[PDB]
Structure formats: structure tokens, C-alpha cells
């Protein structure tokens, strides 16, 4: 009774006499497109238990409740799930009941039942005693709840004997459809399943038995079902088939193609009855028992239903990606393309052997086959017409093969062609007849002479570079005067450059599968006389950087073809300092105490040269003088005036190229700026530190509260030549020396006519910044009265007045204003006044 | 004493020596870049009063009060501003007060002083009585407000002398220096400048005059400084020159040059001495009293310092842009780039005449010269070695020249070369030969039949379409079975194919690069049997388009090279029904009125077709017997349970890839669904009204409260054919009929034993969708009682039944419920009970 693999049914109801003699559907189940709704509950499947994978109906016209079609069905194992769901009702025309009242539990993924027009009576099942994981039940789209209709026995419908369970807050029925129950095994059990009338099933059980805890009374297993018997675990001498059971060995081997494409044999492996080995393994030779442990090609196999697996885009080649071995013969025409290669190392790249030829075609867009690495060795059981097994045709920009320099390869039953492939010289292929020992395979007529490589030098000539010179912005380079076979020929040089601070680098790439793609052109012509060799000016270019050079005679392949050498010097590499440093950038510091600074900035933008060190100039900065002459007891001054949770909240776009002009305009004023800032450049003394190597530095020994002006110059290791670079500067303030704010002698009172008293101190030793003026505090009772006295008021007397004083006792204070901030208050001056 | 042009000062104060016979500056001044702060106060210019353009000072050291430097300077014209500013002080190194404090107006621009360290008295200084617009003002980054210590006379201790001015609330005194304050003409004046001591000036006056309302007494005037005296505007026969005065025509022409000068000679139009006569005009010959209209695009002359302006990319073209002649000659070396063409056409396409030679070379990202449209006619007056004036070098991929079929060109002084532009056909410069009148000038080496488009493609023959099949996604299409002169020659054929809705469609559209990115290439070969032409078989094409075509024999250019024939079918066109048609979308309907409904949808997306008509069948739909057996009176049901927007942004759903997934699987479900949901196709009666053009329609005299479902078909041009195309459909319910849920007729009461009362009535003779329920209120005071009758109860009994009533009168109503909603309440019901 056990039908397998997993069983289709569509487009009529007849199909579904199919089901007959099927109990566990030994895989999924589609019962879906049937349009006709010819027929009724006519078709009863009491057998059917339990579906091992997925279930899938759809557009079963006519279909009004399943639990008419398919009862008894307890369990879905749902081993493998449609997409991540063992059962999809999708758009369901007349669905009224999903019936299911005999289902029980859902072992694997979830469902979607969404999009039924009238289906109803979800709500009362309650998945969460049939199914884990419930939150991803999807079953939006069917009717509205309102008018859904939902009843069933219990909750006022007849027949009413269903239980109330809750699931967040709603302790109520629970049902399947309007005439039945949906029923849960008690707690007694546990984790155990029951029978009906609450008697408990046998622990290695599931959905059902016929007898409390007996093994052959389960309707369905928990774990594991064999010789007709529930078991936790798959008895020895007997290897776990998918899912649900276990077989003998001549059982899991016997099976062959049936229905689906079973192909011969089922591996054992692990102790389990699988379809194929998994990694690191490989089965014995036909024997179908057993695997052994393997690498590289066994591990996965690259045969395709094509006996051509031809790839036109990177996408073409998608399922190739990590594959080993093609069964076939291979055949690229990809004629335009970026990036493409960097695609095909990973799709492709992990090709090893290949069962027959290989060719390419049209494939415009390549410029060196280096991107198929991990292939070893080419049979050629397939091979084309004239004994081809390597074809290689109309290949414009082709330019090498393998890296033949560390690369083995070989070609076992077959020849190769090549043609039409102007960029790829005899050289590349000659060598390659070595090293796959395939020399006399074929005639110089499958490699052609005549068409292949025929732009390509092979090869290029060295120049000679007479003379080099740098400067801040502008490079000046030369080199031999090249001279071909016919002077004629050469029509130009070009001079390639670009900023490479890494000596990994070279053209030969082919850039944009060729030039262009930053390498950044010029071109400089040779000049009239004879006697001069050609030298130009590369400029403005971006100071502190390496800059790899190489040039290129640009010349005439003509009449005479590869005797037209072409030349190519050597990449050199050139600093770009006689150059001055773009002074500092983000210069910061701070005082974490009095003496002390700590200064922090980063790198110079254009430093002009190679990191060496950097320069700090600092100067203590006068306290002006406009201060000073200043009655701060009666100035008061006066002001005068007149994504982002901003939301959407944007700026003119043409609002940032405005804040660009301006930047830019600031910048040009600031390259005009430089030219005369410092003339052709081939109250304190300055104190210096030249930091080594990184960008910070400390310095100390300063005075407590001055503040300092920070020059700070970044200087080169040519810096000595042609002086260090332009100046960045800062102010900052040390911390006060904290206490030396209060008052450092006592007070002094004496009487005056009129009642009143003068008052005399001395003045801090050495104030922080400047003693602005000094906070009287005095009074009879509460030193209510404050008055203020300048530093020069106190300078010419020594200190103040206070004039006509009531009668009595006083007490009285004075505090200091520091530019630091207030000084510490005077201790008490005692004191008196009499009337007369 | 009038100093021309603008006087320029840096790294030195000597050079202010060069301003004692200064007094208006006719032009900007510049004094920056001063570092030695070698003198001080020993410069004096009490002359200078007003410059005509802006002003920058910049790195002055050791400047501390510019009023000191330059007194008396009323106002500035800055005609010619910084930026947008007419006045500059960036870092200034010690500026303590700006002084200026004879600077009373500034008529053009902003100014910008910013980031000096010491600099204080901005805020004194109200702008608003000087410069308008005075938002613009930014002055952020000098000192800190706090130690600015802005101060002068008046405000501190002495007398106030300074005036008191408001702006944005701040009524308080407004001044330049500590010694002297910012005085402002009294409101007397209105508009009129006054001098010292309130005394109003003349109208005709600005900044300040000498006496009250006297010409010759200002200052400086307001609009215009004529003959020693003030003037509104320009007396006759003298002319406007630039910014404040009038002048005679001999002097006009008498200003030849001076350092930075042009003209040599100034021209006067519309009443002006300007430098250049405005667009549209032309100076005839060295006329300077007049200026007449040219009438066309004359008026551009696009010369360049350089004899030779040579581009190498976009940008190196800019200075080009919108200019029509240049005074020299062209040189082009652009070698990669894509767009660059459309924005060649634009930066310089306006090119009408050339003084010499043009010359292109290594321009292997260009394929047609098409680009330079409004060339006409080249002089050659500047001229290559060997009297070349048109030089065509090294350019691989040069297709074809400009359109020769309507376009004219003519080389006056000079012959042409060409050389190395294989893919340039002889024929695109033997037609130049006539058209530039320059047939025998050059012999045909400069045009040698060789290395000139040595390669190109011969000539194409056309290629006939022997049969064209299709399907309802794919095409099988054809050609006659093509024959080289040699048959080796040909070794495949290429299809493009790319959907083309519009006519104007070409071959060089998309192919690749320079033919740009969107023919979708295929390659196939021709068939081992020469009996058999060439087919092939494209498919999967996306319905609605023009889907065009064409075919290119690729062949083996050698040997013969012209020889070689080559081939390229028309541009063919071919359509749907090629792609034969299919389905709808997007349906959407609502009822505005009962037996009224309106259906509105959107265009389908995969139909195969073009606008041809749709197909809507509606059908009633069943109320479903269903909610006829449920009492909804008892019936109550259960539920259960368990920068932009990120101002309110609920999260990023960075999960678009899986919602990918789930979607692309819900598309397969639907295409392995529409596979078999229509096998091979080569209770209420359905409604049919076919749709035009448009995606509305409406459906009239439908039941006023009935369901209706509606398919929706996609039935197009072919449908006949291979049927309709697949069903979305949808269900909406019409309007119900308003007031049709009221009772029809009156109810009847009777007596019934033990108190009670047996309620009939009528029921509605045609109830919007169904009637569900009755409900009875009635009582003796009030109806407080309210209760439910079924629709089957009042079937069986014709009512209701109340039992057990207290005695006396009672009043009775009845309201039922339609599926619509409620009906309305019945009339008054009278009756009684008595006690026994
Ligand atoms: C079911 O089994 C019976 C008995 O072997 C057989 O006659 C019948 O054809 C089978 N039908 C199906 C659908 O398996
Ligand atoms: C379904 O059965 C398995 C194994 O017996 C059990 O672990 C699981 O809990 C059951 N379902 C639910 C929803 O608990
Ligand atoms: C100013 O004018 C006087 C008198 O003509 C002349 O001697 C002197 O060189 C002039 N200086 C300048 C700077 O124009
Ligand atoms: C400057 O003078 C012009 C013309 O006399 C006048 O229109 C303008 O208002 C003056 N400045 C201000 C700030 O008003």
C-alpha cells in the first residue's frame, strides 16, 4: 500500500482512482488543476494515513470540503516542503471546510491557504497543537472573516462536545468543520499521541493507535517505522530509507528508475539508506554499500543533460558554480562583457576534467583564458568533426592563455584549432604544444600563421629612460631616442601614468580588456630636431604619492607585420618629491593640565613626498594691551541682531553645487593664495619639537595660563632641499594654574573722614592670564554690599575706598577675577565705624 | 587723478606707493598677500573715496586699523564682485577695527570676513544703513563674540556721541571705532545723501557732498559723474562708461590697451561705450559711435589663446560650448568614452567656421563625424606640414563622416589626409572630393585605397526572409540560404533582436559600445544539410512590441578583403501574432448605483498584441444556501488570536532579496500553473459586453443587491484564432436598493393564552440580498423589550410568539435586517393583554 514517489493528479478527477490502494504517499502529493468539477464524493480514500513530503492543491473546481475526499490522513511529514510549507491551498474557488478532521500534527514546514474566495474554518484550528513554528502560517488572502461563517459543534452547533483550549488570551473551542471536533491528546500523555475516549498510545508513537501503548496498534510512528513496528532508532543490519522507515541493504540497492528518474542504485552512507554519498565521501565502485573519503573531483560532478553546456553571459554559467568535473564539452561565445571574468573564476573556475572538447567563439569581450585555473586535464571523448577537441576561433582580443610559467595542462583525444585571433601570438601556443603533449597532434594548418596574433607584437622592446626630474606638482621624464627598423614608422609615444603607491601592479592586465579604465592618457609628440630626445611634462599631479610610469611607442603594423617590433620600457616607479608638503589637516589640542598640551592632528592631504616626519612650531601669544587699559567694573557691552528625523526635509541640489562653487572658489583663492605666500622658495621666541613618525605629539613646560600660538608645518625628506611646506595654525590656552587665583597676603583696613574706611591688599604673584578687578564683599551685619575695583583702581591705590558708612561694626571680603575665572575670596576683614 | 584699471598690491607695502594720485579706483583693488609687516602708519590716502569694484585685503601683517590706511572712502560701486561679495577680508592677520569709518554705502554685493583672529567692531557696524541685502553678510568664523571687545565713543564711560539706530530689536548705538562712531544721514534727506552737521545734500548725490544741495559739491554722486557734476543719467552725446560717468566717443575709441585691456576699441551701442557690442549685433570695422544688428548666429567668435585648442575628453571641450567660429585650428585625440558624442554635439556643435586645419587621430571611441553639425565651410589658413588642412589618423572604429545625403561642407585652404580608419569606407571621402571643392587637390596617396578603411565590411547585399512562423511566445524565422563567392567563406549567422515598438529604429541603436547596449545578440549555425536554409528559433519574448529583426552573415575578411561581400537583411519589423496574444491584469470595479456598476482596469502585461479590445464576462453569483440554515439571532461567533521617512522610519526591509524569492515562486507557481490550468487551446446565465479601445466600461440592469464575479479576458486582434487569453476576475455586490428593506405591509396582532401575544406580517417582496433577522421592540411605556426572529421562524409561524406578559396596553415595532443592513422600523403596533 505504500505508493511512491510522490504522486501528480490533474485536470480530471478520474486520475484520483490512482489513490485507491495508497496509505503513506511515500513522498509529496498535487491534486491541483482541476477545472472540470465533474464529479462528487464519489472517490473515498480511507487508506491514505499520512503524506511523507508536501502537499499541493489547486483549482480543483468543484471541491467544497476535503474531509469528503481524504480522511484519516494524521500526519504530514512534510520532508520536503514546497517552498519553505508542507501544504499549499492556494486561490481555492469553492473550498467551504478544509475537513482534515482526522489531521493531527505537522512534523515539517508551515502552510498557505490564501486567496479561497468562500473558504472558511481556519480560526478554530488551533496549529499550535498540530504545528510548531505557527507564525509563518500565511492564509490572508481567503474570505473576509466577517463573513466566513465559522461554526462548529461545541460553540452552539449541534453534535457539541469539542474542548476549549487557548492560544494568547482565547480560552474557547476548537474544531475542524461544522459537524466535528478538533480533538487533543491530554496531558497524561505528555509528548505521547492517544487513541479516541482518552487512552494513551505507546511512547514511540505519533497522530494515532489502535491500543493504548502498543507498537502495532500505531496508526502512525513518531520517529522511525519498520517490520511493522514503531521504533526510536533504525535496527542494526537495516539502513534508514527516507523519511520514515528503514530497508535492508538488497532493498535500498535493488531500486532503480521508476516513474521519476530514480537511476541506478541508493547509496548507504552514515548508517542511513541516502540517494547519493554526501561530501567528503565516494561510493565503491558499483558496489552499492558503502563510501570512502575523497577531495577536489569527487566531491561533486559537472554533467549537464546537454552534451553542450554552452555559456553566452555569466548567468549562462550559473549552475556551474562550484563544479569540478563536466561530463561534455564546453563552448563560450561571449562577445561583450565587464567584469565578467572575476565572475567566471568563481562560476567556473573550479573546472578540473572535461569528457570531450572544449571551444570558443566570438568572445570579444576576453583577453587571457587565466580565469579557467583549476583545469588539469581535457580527454576529448566528445570531439568535433576533423579530430577538433580545442577550438579556438575568431577571437579579436584575445591576448594569452594559461600563465604558462607554473600551469600544467593536458589534452588527451583530440587536436586543437587556432585562427582569427589577431591579439594572441604563435608564442602563446607553441608552448602550449609541450606542456599537453599534443606537438604532433596537428598540422601548422589548425594553427594558422597568417590570422593569429597577427596586431600583436611579440614581442615589444625595452626603452631607456636618460633622464628623470620631479618637483612639487610636475614630473619632467624622458627617454631614448627609439629608433625602429624604419623611422617612418613610429608616428608617436604615448605616456601612460597613474597614481600605484604598490608595486603589485601592472599593464598588462589589459585594463578595460585592453587600455582606458584608470590609467589615465597623454600623449606628447617627438620633437622637430634630430637632436633633441623626447622628454614632456606631466603636471599637477597629486603630491605624496608613488607613481608608476611606463611609456609606449605607438607605431604602424604594416608590409611587414610582426617585424614591426613595438616597444614598451620597463614600469618604472617615481616619487613625486622635489616637492613642499599641503601643511596639516583637522590640527587639534587641548591643556589636560597646566604646562601641558597635548596636540593631535592628521595627515597632510598633498604632503608632497613619503611619510617622514612632521614639524610643530609653537609661540606664546601676547595678552593685548587692549585689555588692559580697560574699566571692566563699568563695561557692560550690548548684542545686536538681525535617513535624518527631519523627514524628507531636503536641500537645492543646485543648493550643493552653490555650496561646491564656493568651496571651489575658496580653494582657487587659496591656490592663488600660495603662489606669493611664500616668495619663490627653492613678543616670544618659537619653541620646536620635530614629531618622528606619527600624528601627535605633547608639550610641556609652558606657562600655566598663556596662550600659545601652534604653527604646525609638515616637512618632507626633501624638506631640506627646497624648505618644508606652508603653515597651519592654532591658538590654544593652558589650564590655569588652579589656586593661584586667591589672594596671596592678607587685608588691610583703615578709618577715613566722613565714615569711611580704605582698604589695602597685596596682588597675586602670578595672576592666570590678568587680574580684571577685584569683588568687595562687605557689610554691618550680612556683607550685603558688593563693589568692584578695577586693577589699575587698585594699582594706583593699592586698593579702594568706601565712603560714608553707618555706624558700627563690619565685616567684610574681596575676590579676585582671574581670566581664568573668579579667584578665591579674601578671609574676613574685621573692621569699624564710628559715628564720630 | 582716476587710477585704471583695478590696482593689484602683494608681498610689500612699497607698492602702496602706487596710490597717492588715487582718488576713485576705477576697477577692484587687491592688497594681499603682505607679510613683512615691515612699515606701519606712514601710507596715507586721504584721496581714494570710492572704488568701482569690489575689494580684497588678505594676509596684511602687521595691519591693525584699515580706516588709518584708507580714509575717506565713502562708498563702494562693486560693480565687478568677489563672488558675490565687494569686499573680502579672509584671515586677516591683526585687524583690530575695521575702520572705514568714512565708508557710508555699498551698492553691489555682500562682503565675506571671516576667520581673522583678532578682528572685532563687525557688530557696531549696522550694514543695514549701508548695504541692503545684508543677510548675505557672514562673518562667522573671527573672533569669538565674548573677547571681541567692540567699544567707541559715546557707549563707553564719556557722553554718547554714537547715534542710536534698531535692527531686529536692538535700539542702541551703531559706530566703527573706539575713537569715532557710525553716523547715518537724518530721514530729512529721505533717499538724498547730507554732509557733517546735518546738512541735507542734493538729490543728484550719494555717500556725502560738501554743501547742502550742490552738484558739484558731492562726494560722490548717486547714478552717474559727468563734467565735474552729478547726474541722473547720460547727457547727450556722450556715452555711458562703465559704472560711474559719461564720456565722448573720441575718447571712447582713444582707450586702445594697458596691461589688461582689449579694445582698442571700446564700441558704443544702445547709448554705452562698452568694451564688445552686445548679441545680436556686430561691430562694423573699428566703429565705436554705433553698433548695428547682424541678424543671425554671427556673433560668437570662439578664438583661443592657443593657436591649436586640442580635446582629449568632454571636459577639455568646455571653453567650446555655445561659440561658433575659431580663429585657428582643431586637434582631436579622444580615445575612450561613451555619451561622449551627445555632449560633442553640444559643447561643440555649433562650429560654423574654422582659420586653418583640424585634425583627428587615435580616436578609437568615435565611429561617425556626424557630431560636428554646424561646420560649414573651413578656411585653412592655419595649415599642416604638406599643406594638409584635414588630417584623419589611427582611428579604428570611424564609420562614416557626416549625413552626406543633405549636409554641405568646403576646405578652403588646404588639401586632406586620411590613413589607418579601416572601418571608414572609400565612399564616405570619395563623395568628399566633389562636395569640398577639393577633387584634384590632393593626390590619392593622402587618401590611399589602402590602410583606409582596409578592413571596414565591404559592402552588405540584403538578405530575404524565405518564411516567418510563430507562436504566442516565440518566432521561427528565416532567410534565403545565403552564398559567398566562395562558400568556405561564411561560417555562421548572427540574429539581432531587441523589442523596437517605433519605426525609427536603425542598426547601430544598440549592438554594443559604440553601437551602444541594448540589441540582445544570438548566434546560430546553418544546418549540416544544404538542403535545408537557414532557420532559427528565437523565443521568449516579451509581449506587446514591434519585436524588430534583422540578420548579419558573419563572414572571414582576407585574401580579397572588399572581395569578401558580406551581407545584412532589411530591418524587418515583424509583431504579435508572431508573439500571438494572452491576458489581463489589474482589475478593479465598484457600484455606484443599484443596478449600476463600474468597471475600471489597467492596460494587461503580457497579451502578445497590440490595443485591439478587451472582454469582460460578468455572471450573478449565488447567495449561498449556507447562511440560510444559520439562526443568526443566537449566532455570535468567536474570534481568536496568537533623509526621508526614517523621521518615522519602522525599519529597513533589507529582506527584498527573500521577498524575491517568495515572489519569483509565486510567478512559477503561476507559469507551471497557466501551463495546464487551460488544457491545449489552439446558477445565473453569463453577460457579455465587449470593450472598445480603453481600460473602462460600465454594467447596467444587474439585481440591486446581487454578487457578481467577473472575468475579465484580454480577447484581442487574433483571439479568433488561438482563443482568448486567461481569466483574473473578482467580485463586487451592486448598491442596494435603498428604501426596498423597509416592510411592504402592516402587522397583525392576536391574543394567546396565558398573557401572550402572536405577532404576523408581510414579509419584503424583494429583500436586498436576504433578510436575516427580525427584530421586535415593543413594551407598554416604553418598548424596552427587544427581540430576534429568524427567517425561518417567520416562515414557519408567518411571525412571532410573546409569552407571559404583564397586563395592560403595549406598543409594538418590528425593524428588520437585510444583508444590506437594517431595514426601517414598522409603524406603531397597538394591542393589549388583560390579566385573566
Ligand atoms: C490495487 O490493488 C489491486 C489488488 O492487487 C489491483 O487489482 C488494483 O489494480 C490496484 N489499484 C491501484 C490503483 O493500485
Ligand atoms: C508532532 O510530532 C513530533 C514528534 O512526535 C513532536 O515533537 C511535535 O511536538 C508534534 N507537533 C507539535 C505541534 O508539537
Ligand atoms: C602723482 O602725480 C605727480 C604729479 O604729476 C607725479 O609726479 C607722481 O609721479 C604721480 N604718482 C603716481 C603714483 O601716480
Ligand atoms: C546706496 O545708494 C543707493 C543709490 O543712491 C541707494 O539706492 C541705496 O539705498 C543706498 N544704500 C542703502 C543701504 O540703502
Known sequence: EICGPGIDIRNDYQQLKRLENCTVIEGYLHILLISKAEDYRSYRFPKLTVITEYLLLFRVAGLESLGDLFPNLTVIRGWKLFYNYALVIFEMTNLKDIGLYNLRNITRGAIRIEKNADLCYLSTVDWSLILDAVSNNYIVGNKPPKECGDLCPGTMEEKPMCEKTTINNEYNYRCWTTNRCQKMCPSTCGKRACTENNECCHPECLGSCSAPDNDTACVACRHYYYAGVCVPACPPNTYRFEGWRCVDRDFCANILSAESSDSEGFVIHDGECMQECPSGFIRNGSQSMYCIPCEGPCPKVCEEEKKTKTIDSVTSAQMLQGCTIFKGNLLINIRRGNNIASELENFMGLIEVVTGYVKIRHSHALVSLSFLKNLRLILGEEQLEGNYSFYVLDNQNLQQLWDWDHRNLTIKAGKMYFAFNPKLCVSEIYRMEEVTGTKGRQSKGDINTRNNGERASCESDVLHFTSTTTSKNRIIITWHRYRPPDYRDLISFTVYYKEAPFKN??????????????????????????????????????????????????????????????????????????????????????????????????????????????????????????????????????????????????????????????????????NFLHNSIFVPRPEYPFFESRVDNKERTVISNLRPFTLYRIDIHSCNHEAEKLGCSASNFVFARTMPAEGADDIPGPVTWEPRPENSIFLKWPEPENPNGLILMYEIKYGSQVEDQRECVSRQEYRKYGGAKLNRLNPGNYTARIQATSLSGNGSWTDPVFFYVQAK
Chains 1, 2 share one sequence.
Open 505 to 670: 601592479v601592472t599593464e598588462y592586465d589589459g585594463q578595460d580588456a585592453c587600455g582606458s579604465n584608470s590609467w589615465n592618457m597623454v600623449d606628447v609628440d617627438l620633437p622637430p630636431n634630430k637632436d633633441v630626445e623626447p622628454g614632456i611634462l606631466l603636471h599637477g599631479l597629486k603630491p605624496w604619492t608613488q607613481y608608476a610610469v611606463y611609456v609606449k611607442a605607438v607605431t604602424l603594423t604594416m608590409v611587414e607585420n610582426d617585424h614591426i617590433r613595438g616597444a614598451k620600457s620597463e614600469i618604472l616607479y617615481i616619487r613625486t618629491n622635489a616637492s613642499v608638503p599641503s601643511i596639516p589637516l583637522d590640527v587639534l589640542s587641548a591643556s589636560n593640565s597646566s604646562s601641558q598640551l597635548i596636540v593631535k592632528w592628521n595627515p597632510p592631504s598633498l604632503p608632497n613626498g613619503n611619510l617622514s616626519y612632521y614639524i610643530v612650531r609653537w609661540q606664546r601669544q601676547p595678552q593685548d594691551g587692549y585689555l588692559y587699559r580697560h574699566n571692566y567694573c563699568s563695561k557692560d557691552k550690548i548684542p545686536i541682531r538681525k535617513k535624518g528625523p527631519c523627514c524628507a526635509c531636503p536641500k537645492t541640489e543646485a543648493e550643493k553645487q552653490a555650496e561646491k562653487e564656493e568651496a571651489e572658489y575658496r580653494k582657487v583663492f587659496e
